[PDB]
């Protein structure tokens, strides 16, 4: 109920290190695909860690 | 006119967006301000 919302902007985000590292038990993307994340430049990114 | 004040409570309980006009700096400090009843800036005459 106190999920940490962090602002991510004005930086180069390398999602490959997250995707290739199989330490996660659930890496699901809905509006995009995890493999194509390294070719899109995003307007604004929210991180919600909890 | 020297700027505008924004917020929801304006008594240091919550955040407050603030804008001031100046020839050098237009600082937009988003802080927790314990705002006064009459926030005003005086200039000599």
């Amino acid at each position, epitope marked *: *109920y*106190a*999920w*940490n*919302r*962090k602002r991510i902007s004005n930086c180069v985000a390398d999602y490959s290190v997250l995707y290739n590292s199989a330490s996660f038990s659930t890496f699901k993307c809905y509006g995009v695909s995890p493999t194509k994340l390294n070719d899109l430049c995003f307007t604004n990114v929210y991180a919600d860690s*909890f | 006119i020297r700027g505008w004040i924004f917020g929801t409570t304006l008594d*240091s*309980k*919550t*955040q407050s967006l603030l804008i001031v006009n100046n020839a050098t700096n237009v600082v937009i400090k988003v802080c*927790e301000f314990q705002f006064c009843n009459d926030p005003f800036l005086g200039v000599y005459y």
Partner: nanobody
Amino acid sequence: VQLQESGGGLVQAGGSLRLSCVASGRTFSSLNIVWFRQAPGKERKFVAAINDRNTAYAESVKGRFTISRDNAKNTVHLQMNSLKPEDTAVYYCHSADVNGGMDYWGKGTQVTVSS
């Protein structure tokens, strides 16, 4: 940035204690406190919460306590009255800010009471 909970000394049944949860911060008045209870090896529970305008206690401490606020100090304090030997627990205190969800959990204080 953090919270430290100190106190919880050795007292007698029916006595009065003064436990303070001093917070490293600058708007802890907005960060309303919640007190939690854990039995010595049993399931956890809450105690009280002075959420600004009003208060809310637990069934074990219903009205027996005098919860207090130190808004000029950004610290919280609980008054313990009619203490019982069956309330031997480790009280907690926590506050979460409205913006950017986050926790400032403390450490705990013993509530050992003789019978």
